[PDB]
Ligand binder design. Structure first.
Ligand code: HZC
Length: 372
């Protein structure tokens, strides 16, 4: 243990004026907190670990945050979501008074979100970013373990962004995928699941998914009002993308961070959206395509077309994304004809380059917030 960042909500670790993060470290996973001593009311940091099975029937995701959003609910927030094959879901925001992140002499990174009652979520990440382990010990809620492993010939290190511009969604907003393609497993037990509130176990093995590391001093409404995130496996392709559509505060500009791997090699890295590669992400409406669920809010899309293009590509890669199974649904405004919300999906996805028709699944989510 060589570097430690330990924050408690209760102690003044949260200041009401802006703070500049630590500089972006090129060719690093930047897993150590960029706001190590204190965060501002605007600042946020994310360590996210999402999994799903190869059959697109089971999902389990954990987002660990450091931000001020959960202070009046007594902690830092962790978002835990699960879907079973019968369509039953479990979704909770979990609050933890203490968040601790350490870098160890062996080069591993450890994180612990710790409650007053002794309950915790912990992560442990390899020095070369090829493995991550989470342990859940939240009494009355969820216990178990999650593992993500990169088995690629090419090291995660060789694919890490080499500049701020390759690590950024937009100025001052960092969003990264340091593990690249991962095999996943989950063994978990939930105390109360479904209408009957009976305990249930969840298992994934040799599944798919991905890890996100992001941070900013800029709060989300200042750079977006709509976002789509997905991690997916489509035959030999592994893809991960965040795409935002701007609020009035960025003159409605769109932004994206996107990566596309072929059998563990990085083939397309895009930090630009055209709607040094570029992505195009276009919503599919239910009057255009017969397959795909819509969400329950004002966004009626039934999926997306995702294209990755180079400057020296004729056709690049095109992926058709259809919403197949609902994971979570939560409003983000008062109800009405323009009521907004957030929707998580198991996605069905197909395509590749011209002449390719690979098929697989993703774990996706979309959000709108009522910022003009
Ligand atoms: C409620 C308003 C009309 C919505 C809010 C969500 C955003 C994505 C689009 C509009 C604002 N342009």
């Amino acid at each position: 243990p060589t570097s430690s960042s330990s924050l408690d909500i209760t102690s003044n670790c949260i200041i009401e004026t802006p703070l500049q993060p630590s500089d972006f470290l090129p060719k690093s996973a930047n897993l150590f907190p960029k706001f190590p001593e204190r965060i501002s009311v605007d600042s946020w940091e994310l360590w996210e670990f999402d999994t799903f099975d190869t059959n697109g029937s089971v999902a389990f995701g954990c987002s660990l945050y450091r931000d001020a959003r959960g202070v009046e609910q007594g902690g830092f927030h962790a978002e835990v979501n699960a879907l079973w094959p019968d369509g039953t879901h479990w979704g909770e925001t979990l609050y933890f008074a203490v968040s601790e992140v350490v870098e160890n002499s062996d080069g591993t990174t450890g994180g612990k979100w710790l409650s007053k009652d002794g309950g915790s979520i912990t992560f442990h990440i390899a020095s070369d970013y090829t493995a991550a382990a989470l342990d859940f010990n939240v009494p009355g809620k969820v216990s178990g373990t999650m593992e993500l492993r990169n088995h690629a010939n090419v090291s995660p290190t060789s694919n890490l962004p080499a500049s701020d511009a390759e690590a950024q969604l937009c100025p001052g907003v960092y969003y990264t995928f340091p593990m690249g393609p991962v095999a996943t497993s989950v063994t978990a037990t939930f105390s109360s699941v479904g209408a009957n509130g009976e305990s249930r176990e969840l298992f994934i093995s040799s599944g798919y998914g991905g890890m996100v590391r992001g941070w900013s001093a800029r709060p989300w409404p200042t750079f977006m009002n709509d976002a789509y995130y997905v991690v997916a496996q489509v035959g030999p392709y592994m893809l991960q993308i965040l795409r935002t559509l701007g609020s009035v505060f960025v003159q409605h500009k769109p932004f994206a961070v996107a990566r596309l791997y072929l059998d563990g090699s990085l083939v397309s890295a895009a930090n630009t959206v055209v709607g040094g590669d570029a992505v195009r992400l276009t919503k599919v409406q239910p009057d255009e395509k017969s397959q795909g669920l819509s969400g329950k809010f004002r966004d009626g899309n039934v999926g997306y077309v995702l294209e990755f293009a180079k400057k020296d590509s004729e056709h690049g890669w095109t992926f058709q994304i259809s919403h197949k199974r609902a994971v979570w649904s939560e409003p983000t405004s008062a109800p009405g004809p323009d009521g907004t919300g957030k929707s998580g999906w198991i996605e069905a996805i197909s395509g590749g380059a011209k002449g390719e028709n690979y098929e697989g699944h993703g774990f996706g989510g979309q959000l709108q917030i009522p910022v003009p």
